[PDB]
Amino acid sequence: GAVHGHRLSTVVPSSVTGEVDYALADADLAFKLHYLRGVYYYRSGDGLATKVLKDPMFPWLDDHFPVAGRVRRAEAEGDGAPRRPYIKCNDCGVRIVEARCDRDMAEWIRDAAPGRIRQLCYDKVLGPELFFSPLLYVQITNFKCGGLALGFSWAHLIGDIPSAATCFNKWAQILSGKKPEATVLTPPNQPLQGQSPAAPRSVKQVGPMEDLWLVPAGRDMACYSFHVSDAVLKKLHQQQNGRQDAAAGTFELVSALVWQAVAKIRGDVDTVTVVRADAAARSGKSLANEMKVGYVESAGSSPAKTDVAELAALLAKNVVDETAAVAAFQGDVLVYGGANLTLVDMEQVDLYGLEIKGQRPVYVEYGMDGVGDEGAVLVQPDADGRGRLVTVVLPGDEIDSLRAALGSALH
Amino acid sequence: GAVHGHRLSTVVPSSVTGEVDYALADADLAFKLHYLRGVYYYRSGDGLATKVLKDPMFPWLDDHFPVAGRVRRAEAEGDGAPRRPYIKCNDCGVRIVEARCDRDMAEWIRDAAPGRIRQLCYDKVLGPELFFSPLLYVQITNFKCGGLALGFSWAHLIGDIPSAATCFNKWAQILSGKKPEATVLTPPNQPLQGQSPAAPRSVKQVGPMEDLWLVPAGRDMACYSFHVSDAVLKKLHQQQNGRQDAAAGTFELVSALVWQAVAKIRGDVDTVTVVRADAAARSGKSLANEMKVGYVESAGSSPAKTDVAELAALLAKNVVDETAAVAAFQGDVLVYGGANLTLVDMEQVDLYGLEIKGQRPVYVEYGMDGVGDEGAVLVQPDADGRGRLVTVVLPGDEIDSLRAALGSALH
Amino acid sequence: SAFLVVFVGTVYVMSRPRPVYLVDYACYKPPASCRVPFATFMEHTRLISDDDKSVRFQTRILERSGLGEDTCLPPANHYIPPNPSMEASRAEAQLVIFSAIDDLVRRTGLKPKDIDILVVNCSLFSPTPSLSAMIINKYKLRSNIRSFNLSGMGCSAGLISIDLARDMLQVHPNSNALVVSTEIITPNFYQGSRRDMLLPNCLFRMGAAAILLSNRRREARRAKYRLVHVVRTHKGADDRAYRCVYEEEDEQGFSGISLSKELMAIAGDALKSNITTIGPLVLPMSEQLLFFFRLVGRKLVNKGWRPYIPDFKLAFEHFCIHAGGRAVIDELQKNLQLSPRHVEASRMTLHRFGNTSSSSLWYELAYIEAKGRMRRGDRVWQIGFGSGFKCNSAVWKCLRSIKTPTNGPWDDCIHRYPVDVPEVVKL
Amino acid sequence: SAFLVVFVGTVYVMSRPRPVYLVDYACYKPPASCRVPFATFMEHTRLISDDDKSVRFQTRILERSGLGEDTCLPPANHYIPPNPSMEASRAEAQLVIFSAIDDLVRRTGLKPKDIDILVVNCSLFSPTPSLSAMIINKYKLRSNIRSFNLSGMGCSAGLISIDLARDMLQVHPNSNALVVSTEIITPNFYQGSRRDMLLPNCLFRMGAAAILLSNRRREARRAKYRLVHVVRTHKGADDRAYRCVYEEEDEQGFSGISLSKELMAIAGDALKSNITTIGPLVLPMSEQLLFFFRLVGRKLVNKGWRPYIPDFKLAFEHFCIHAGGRAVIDELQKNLQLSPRHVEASRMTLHRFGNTSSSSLWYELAYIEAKGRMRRGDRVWQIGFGSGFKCNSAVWKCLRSIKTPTNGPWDDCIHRYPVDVPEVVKL
Ligand SMILES: CC(C)(COP(=O)(O)OP(=O)(O)OC[C@H]1O[C@@H](n2cnc3c(N)ncnc32)[C@H](O)[C@@H]1OP(=O)(O)O)[C@@H](O)C(=O)NCCC(=O)NCCS
Ligand SMILES: CC(C)(COP(=O)(O)OP(=O)(O)OC[C@H]1O[C@@H](n2cnc3c(N)ncnc32)[C@H](O)[C@@H]1OP(=O)(O)O)[C@@H](O)C(=O)NCCC(=O)NCCS
């Protein structure tokens, strides 16, 4: 009942780009150890053989030619204590895996075992051959009923979650016959005179590994997905009575609910970071990790016995943003679970904008690879936009206990 | 260590024989369940690649065209309860197996392990697809030292041991450049008009097998080779002193020695049959089973403590001939080890007559296959032509107990 | 003035084509050390295939196929299983080709440095360098030779090579053309079990032919035949007749030719589409006018009278039908109402040599020579059909009467032919 | 009288050879969805071969190969690993042929029933029915068409097909010949690890050409070139030259083309043996008489003076050297002393399209047409070398000046050419 027949391929830019050095920014290299794992389910894949899904990728990669590039390294000024990487824009391409599944797709949507995102999207990283590792992978599975599951394996080095979701929208628009927006990538990034010796409280400076940009697991991290309905956030709105409301009800109480769920299984969950996927902080939205990294301390109230609205007000209005300190730090960062449990707010993105012909996706979930040693949650909107969808990536020992410690509030 | 790389092939007669129904004698149908497994070793196989060994097989096979035939079954006149087989002389051919071994050949010749003929010639019989089973298998193995071992697997149906050995010598005479003698097969063998309803005492009739012309073993029969010298021949020749010498000590003393050796491992060996391969009774040797089958009872007394000279004088001149009733008997008679131990005397045959270029063989041992639950010994001349060589075929659990009983007398 | 007969003279002479002379030809006779009887082919078939369906089908086809016990296979189809490589097939191409050119050079006195045109054809096997560069390497032919390699053109590329050398023997004068036409059947062995792809396994045997053509006027006394007509009919425009004989790969990934079920009707309407473009050329005038008078009789009385086929027995003395199969020959004998003597070369070449190659026509010509029936002034017809359903034809005219000891491929067995070829073979 | 000029008139006219005009030709332009750069070729090599010895070789070859970034491989070598079947290679033959003839039919007004000669060549791929029968089935050509499939003759069969269509048009009057020169490189991919058999993996790219030749007098106002000379040189009699380019099988059983180590010492001496048999034809008398007046000067004075090389820059204006590799073009620039403008067509064809086929000369001709440098009465030299080391050459002469928009295979990139082609690709 697993996927098989992994036929690999490569789609390249349709035009020669010449010698180009897309120089990565400081925040580009601060997020290099993480990997977006995103799949997009569809109720029908008729008329969608893997030549009409691959032929729009040649004009799509013309506008996004650093995605088809490869990582190289330059030389330092004096002795080579740093070696700043850059995406060499040779037309080296991105992998197109064409798998197939024999199980029914709808019964795989109704699943509790955390093995969906690891199976349905191709699990490679910027691996041991760092100079020959693609920055994007597409897995196109076909089910027994006839569904379609476009699974994108995006590398967080080149661009973040808005710059990944809109980049996939810009391919679905070419597939739908539309004309996408012309993407800027024109102002070249420059190294800032930083070196940031005051280390952030959101990070954990790992050892400077050479050619494997994937901090190893240690634990047994797995990507479990659960959907939260629209009526549950109404129950998250009938608790903050008699006081002022500064919690953004679309994300903040949803994060505090799973924070309270983790604060019955794990004791030391005191410090917690967030990474704000804000659209207003997209100053020159080209392809860049424009996340807002900020940690939240709970100095007086422990989160294990405190109500979810109080944790919501603690996380929302009391944040210490350090998104420039993580950029100015000298690499090897691992912000997705370095010291604290991370909460990602990627709900503002047009996640269901992967219209192939006129087909809205029926389920869109994201997962992460290279998550740190405390875990991560990934809130994201559902198909109708009423409720939310949370894919939590726990160390794996706490998955089945979260099924009991969380199902009481959902039921 | 073991033989590998079995490359099967097929050589056919060089001229079309047309449709020829080569009828079989009753003595040919009596011996149809046994199989000659005889290998011929060589110190050097230079100039003997498997084309110059295969091209003389085509002018050899049209000389002996019923060897390349296949067994069929005619329809009876009245009720079809008997159906007489006949070798239909279509040029289906004989198998050529071209294997190799990375072992030193001289160490394998001096190996006391009973599995040597099982590996060096092709273990196939007239199998369950009886109408398409080859009647002869040559196995040509080449050694790392540079030797050669022609392994001839001969079906006893078509011809006996003189009629196999002289046929292989007739092949080697064409291979060397000589001219072989007139291979007569001109009088057609006819079914004799004798029924013989009483079974002979030298045999045990097995069940009426349909298409597998091989009795299933039950036990784990193997063939052990031990060289007996002419000094051991003269040693037993000084034991019939003070008596008249009528026991032909070229065969009789050795067969009495192995009978005395098996009469401390098995208790009831008092009646032992002897298949006499006489050269004076070869009335028109064409391709025929002109053996002499006779059972010998040991005068009531037990051979457990009887001397080998008394056993020689008891087994030589006191033979009750049954070779005219084992042929006239109808159906699956199992001569070689059916009800009595068999002592075959294949020593007068031209066994080292495989002159290939000028090359005498260094070692020739014959084994059998399909031997019943009583055993079989096989004397044959050794390389000097003075002593003997015995390949004894025991159940397998009697092999190593014979090594303790015969090693003192051989010394 | 006497300058009115020279303008119907030398102008007419310079408008006449050069004659193409078949000097001799040397058909390769395979040794008896490579023959495959019916019984050993059946025993090799039911030893590598476990199913009792694809052995019971080849057993019926090889029974009712008209092949005999003298048909030969290369020294790689004798193993169980066969091991065809590119070094065991090219070594089989250095055997059937070179020992057929050597049988031609010694019997005509041909010098290799006076070969100007070389046309080799082999359907499946086409290595790099080709089978023409192999002959140029072997016999050390000249650096300005016109070499060609017509590969992939089926079992009718013998007459395509004949027409190619003939149309090269009109542009270049005083030249000799070596035409080699083989079929290397070591990689032509299908391995799987598809029932439409197992017919080239049960029909294709060893065979080769080296042909020496020349347009020199000195060779008018040494040549045996003069080439008169070559008529080509490529029926590949139909979709059925193009994918009829068609090389595929099955589900296991084994290559092989696949013969369709309607191979017979596609053939018989490509033969008669070649007969109606050779009837105006080779028939007598009386038969043509009688056919026209019986053709205009179905125009005014009733739309379709009885079909009057012209008698080709009064237009040819020898018929060389390409020995494809037994069913293909006796339906062409059924059409043209041929005698059993007329199809006797094609039946006994199918019996002796099997369906060899595109060069079965030359073994048939050597049969009707070796029987001593080839008088001078006789007309030869060579009907050859293949893949893409090109159905080419050729008309030769005998120059000198051929002696009975021919030293060809039929010499050791011409006194045991013809044989009664039965409908079935007893097994 | 009045017959004093007729017999030196119309007798000479009936001895005059028929002219063969190149009407038009259409090269296949592969789409940019099938392009293979240097980087993805390297990343595809170091994912199916774990040994870093047959990868560090590919690095040096494709670095110093002169192939650019727009070279195209078929849609079966884009997979990791490639899955070259027969269906994926036959359906790739239906892409590069049927969209190169359709570019020729729509630009010439050619009818399918006005095709009388069809000469297709493709070295490695040769299916059954032939590649010519595929064209006859698709375009529905006539029943009596002269169809020839020259398979196995290597990368120099692009001019063997031209010479064959030349000689077939001398026999048949008022006919149109179609010449398709391809290389179906889906089965031409080496699957092993031997170093000598890995050079066709780096250089062989996609390409085709569909040529229309005719002998009609009406095709002299519309046609582009007239065929002057075709000179064939077959060095296959030598044993070093025969087995230089050889289709072997390696130890693991993977077929492929095995180039020898002395590839340039044979291709420089199979080509300078082709210069001497084209010198008397194409040079002026003022070069030839000076050449043998200096050649008699090294006969009686001493055993060889300083060798004067005949200027072919005074004999031709346009050179189309076959784009085999970079190391052949730079040494032919050394011997013949050509300018970089003369070898600009071959270098930019190797850079844009790569070592395509036997039809790289037609992409070079489209280069020197698309730049507008092809005037009236210009002489074109097309040197082509292959396997068996046939080294054929051809000389054309332009009949009408070609305009700059030519809608061929160069249109989108002719304003960015020529480019500086470096020695090593910096990676
Ligand atoms: C076999 C051949 C003798 C004709 O058939 P036949 O054996 O004379 O006669 P049959 O009536 O037995 O033929 C039909 C049988 O063979 C099978 N058969 C015959 N041709 C078949 C084909 N092309 N594909 C599949 N099955 C075929 C039929 O299925 C039937 O077997 P079945 O019981 O499974 O249905 C054979 O010569 C032939 O078909 N033509 C050969 C032509 C050729 O090879 N041309 C190449 C040109 S050089
Ligand atoms: C490919 C080409 C650029 C040569 O590249 P290059 O830069 O000259 O490469 P070199 O041969 O000097 O590189 C050295 C290596 O080449 C290898 N090599 C080169 N040609 C080889 C051949 N034919 N077989 C085996 N090895 C070969 C050597 O094994 C050597 O190994 P190394 O790495 O240990 O030194 C080109 O000049 C060429 O080889 N010509 C072929 C033209 C052609 O293919 N013809 C087309 C129609 S046939």
Coordinates of N, CA and C and ligand atoms in Angstrom, one line a residue, chain C residues 57 60-61 64-65 155 195-197 199 203-204 245 258-264 322-328 355 357 385-386, ligand 1:
Chain C
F57 N 2.4 -25.2 -29.8 CA 2.2 -24.3 -31.0 C 3.3 -24.3 -32.0
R60 N 3.2 -27.6 -33.7 CA 2.3 -27.7 -34.9 C 2.8 -26.9 -36.1
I61 N 3.4 -25.7 -35.9 CA 3.9 -25.0 -37.0 C 5.1 -25.6 -37.6
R64 N 3.7 -28.6 -39.7 CA 3.0 -28.2 -41.0 C 3.7 -27.1 -41.7
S65 N 5.0 -26.9 -41.5 CA 5.8 -25.8 -42.0 C 6.5 -26.1 -43.3
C155 N 12.8 -9.3 -45.9 CA 13.3 -10.5 -46.7 C 13.0 -10.3 -48.1
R195 N 2.9 -15.6 -29.1 CA 2.7 -16.6 -30.1 C 2.8 -16.1 -31.5
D196 N 2.6 -14.7 -31.8 CA 2.9 -14.1 -33.1 C 4.3 -13.8 -33.4
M197 N 5.2 -13.9 -32.3 CA 6.6 -13.6 -32.5 C 7.5 -14.8 -32.5
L199 N 7.2 -17.2 -34.9 CA 7.3 -17.8 -36.2 C 8.6 -17.5 -36.9
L203 N 11.2 -20.7 -38.6 CA 11.3 -20.6 -40.0 C 12.7 -20.2 -40.5
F204 N 13.3 -19.2 -39.8 CA 14.5 -18.6 -40.3 C 15.7 -19.5 -40.0
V245 N 4.1 -7.4 -40.9 CA 5.4 -7.9 -40.5 C 6.1 -6.7 -39.8
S258 N 7.1 -9.8 -35.5 CA 5.8 -10.2 -35.1 C 4.9 -10.3 -36.4
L259 N 4.5 -11.5 -36.8 CA 3.7 -11.7 -38.0 C 2.2 -11.7 -37.6
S260 N 1.5 -10.9 -38.3 CA 0.0 -10.7 -38.0 C -0.7 -11.9 -38.5
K261 N -2.0 -12.0 -38.1 CA -2.9 -13.1 -38.5 C -3.3 -13.0 -39.9
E262 N -3.4 -11.8 -40.4 CA -3.8 -11.6 -41.8 C -2.6 -11.4 -42.7
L263 N -1.5 -12.1 -42.4 CA -0.3 -12.1 -43.3 C -0.5 -12.7 -44.6
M264 N -1.4 -13.6 -44.8 CA -1.7 -14.3 -46.0 C -2.4 -13.4 -47.0
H322 N 9.8 -16.9 -53.5 CA 10.6 -16.8 -52.3 C 10.0 -17.7 -51.2
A323 N 10.8 -18.7 -50.7 CA 10.3 -19.7 -49.8 C 10.0 -19.1 -48.4
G324 N 8.9 -18.5 -48.3 CA 8.5 -17.9 -47.0 C 7.9 -19.0 -46.1
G325 N 6.9 -19.6 -46.5 CA 6.3 -20.7 -45.8 C 5.6 -21.7 -46.7
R326 N 5.1 -22.8 -46.2 CA 4.4 -23.7 -47.0 C 3.0 -23.2 -47.5
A327 N 2.3 -22.4 -46.6 CA 1.0 -21.9 -47.0 C 1.2 -20.7 -48.0
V328 N 2.3 -20.1 -48.0 CA 2.5 -18.9 -48.9 C 2.8 -19.4 -50.3
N355 N 13.3 -21.5 -44.8 CA 13.2 -20.1 -45.1 C 14.5 -19.4 -44.7
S357 N 16.6 -16.6 -45.9 CA 17.0 -15.2 -45.9 C 16.1 -14.5 -46.9
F385 N 9.1 -11.2 -51.4 CA 8.3 -10.4 -50.5 C 8.8 -10.4 -49.1
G386 N 8.6 -9.3 -48.4 CA 9.2 -9.1 -47.1 C 8.4 -8.1 -46.2
Ligands
LIG1 C1 2.7 -21.3 -40.1 C2 2.6 -21.1 -41.6 C3 3.1 -22.4 -42.2 C4 1.2 -20.8 -42.0 O1 0.3 -21.5 -41.1 P1 0.3 -23.1 -41.1 O2 1.1 -23.5 -40.0 O3 0.6 -23.5 -42.5 O4 -1.2 -23.4 -40.7 P2 -2.2 -23.3 -39.5 O5 -3.6 -23.4 -40.0 O6 -1.8 -24.2 -38.4 O7 -1.9 -21.8 -39.0 C5 -2.8 -21.2 -38.0 C6 -2.3 -21.7 -36.7 O8 -1.1 -21.0 -36.3 C7 -1.4 -19.8 -35.6 N1 -0.9 -18.7 -36.4 C8 -0.5 -18.7 -37.7 N2 0.1 -17.6 -38.1 C9 0.0 -16.8 -37.0 C10 0.4 -15.5 -36.7 N3 0.9 -14.7 -37.7 N4 0.2 -15.0 -35.5 C11 -0.4 -15.7 -34.6 N5 -0.8 -17.0 -34.7 C12 -0.6 -17.5 -35.9 C13 -2.9 -19.7 -35.5 O9 -3.2 -19.1 -34.3 C14 -3.2 -21.2 -35.5 O10 -2.7 -21.7 -34.3 P3 -3.9 -21.6 -33.2 O11 -4.5 -23.0 -33.2 O12 -3.3 -21.2 -31.9 O13 -4.9 -20.6 -33.7 C15 3.5 -19.9 -41.9 O14 4.3 -20.2 -43.0 C16 2.8 -18.6 -42.1 O15 1.9 -18.3 -41.4 N6 3.3 -17.8 -43.0 C17 4.8 -17.6 -43.2 C18 5.1 -16.3 -44.0 C19 6.4 -15.6 -43.6 O16 7.0 -16.0 -42.7 N7 6.7 -14.5 -44.3 C20 8.0 -13.9 -44.2 C21 8.4 -13.4 -45.6 S1 10.1 -13.8 -46.1

